[PDB]
Nucleic acid binder design. Structure first.
Lengths: 63, 62
DNA sequence: TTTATAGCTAGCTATAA
DNA sequence: TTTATAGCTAGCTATA
């Protein structure tokens, strides 16, 4: 999943940082990079009960 | 998931290490500690197509 | 609220038995 | 094969 999809999912940056257990500064860094680091994407996919999918899972499932 | 479940799943430490994209020495650390680090547990769950469950998922389904 | 970035350390890899 | 641990940096937190 892309940082903007994470922000849509929880509603804003503050709620996204609380939703995945980081500081807002981590979410702004993902947004600026246009990318969530890979173990983090797995952890977000797990912690959201797969409502958000990692790039790994989307690729594996054939997009 | 516990480090013993991870190793039983792949067959041995070498195969576990290849299976989750780490060196065997990372797997020996998890076994000796008795725990796999949290983000790592999530990655193993995703990379095994949910065949192994993180402690988080195990607890949530309980 | 967001940007920019210094500064730290968990959790790896590398190594030497 | 496994132990013990040094060497190291990605990816955070803390800040300004």
């Amino acid at each position: 999943m892309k940082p903007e999809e994470l922000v849509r999912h929880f509603g804003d940056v503050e709620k996204a940082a609380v939703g995945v257990g980081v500081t807002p500064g981590a979410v702004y860094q993902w947004l600026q990079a246009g990318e969530i680091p890979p173990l983090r994407q797995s952890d977000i996919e797990v912690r959201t009960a797969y409502k958000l999918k990692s790039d790994f899972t989307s690729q594996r499932m054939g997009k």
